[PDB]
Design a protein around this nucleic acid. Structure first.
Length: 223
DNA sequence: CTGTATCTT
DNA sequence: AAAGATAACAG
């Protein structure tokens, strides 16, 4: 029992011994000694703890973790109780309300409900220095997350990838566009949401693509 | 009014 | 690479 869920560890451990990862983890450790880094150590890999890797069906991809005190916890866009939904999440909920008829604001920002249904809540970069958005980009996280996306692309079928923001969209290259579905839009952050997110209907679209593939749809209200 | 991306140089 | 411009709205 530990940081990486068993199935994920079993399919990603090969990255552990690679120089870029040994260097990456070294960087994060040094940063944590001089600054506050989010999320906490034991929460950087929460996204491997919600469901078996062979059960992922949808992948919502973000940029990097929330950089405010105790928001980030391993699942992209999610915040544990009693932390109130951050602006980006309130925008996700707003999109969900007009996109999904029955969806109503859950009264909290914890997205474990989606994750448990097979929605991988990943960010392109997995750690961030307090108060500095995307401060840990280009340190090795992207290559690690490329490995994640790559395993899914190669070992799964009919997955729905949701790329939110320019950085997440960089993963676009790694996905067989005819073997999987890739939907891309602006980051739900207030600073960019008006660039396409509001009105993207990614949630209903995901379910329609899912149904056509013969998979049960995600119950976005199940939170 | 301040804090929450994206494009350009 | 890093910073300026630009932008849109809830707390």
């Amino acid at each position: 029992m530990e940081f990486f869920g068993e199935s994920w560890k079993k399919h990603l451990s090969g990255e552990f011994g690679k120089p870029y990862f040994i260097k990456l983890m070294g960087f994060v450790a040094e940063e944590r000694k001089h600054y506050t880094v989010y999320p906490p150590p034991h929460q950087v890999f929460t996204w491997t703890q919600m469901c078996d890797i062979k059960d992922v069906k949808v992948v919502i991809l973000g940029q990097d973790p929330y950089h405010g005190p105790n928001q980030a916890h391993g699942l992209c866009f999610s915040v544990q109780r009693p932390v109130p939904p951050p602006p980006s999440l309130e925008n996700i909920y707003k999109e969900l309300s007009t996109d999904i008829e029955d969806f109503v604001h859950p009264g909290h920002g914890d997205l474990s409900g989606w994750a448990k249904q097979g929605v991988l809540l990943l960010n392109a970069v997995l750690t961030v220095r307090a108060h500095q958005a995307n401060s840990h980009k280009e340190r090795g996280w992207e290559q690690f997350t490329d490995a994640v996306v790559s395993w899914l692309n190669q070992n799964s079928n009919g997955l729905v990838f949701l790329l939110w923001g320019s950085y997440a969209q960089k993963k676009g290259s790694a996905i067989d566009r005819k073997r999987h579905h890739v939907l891309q839009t602006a980051h739900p952050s207030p600073a960019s949401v008006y660039r396409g997110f509001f009105g993207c209907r990614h949630f209903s679209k995901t379910n329609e693509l899912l149904q056509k593939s013969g998979k049960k749809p995600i119950d976005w209200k199940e939170l």
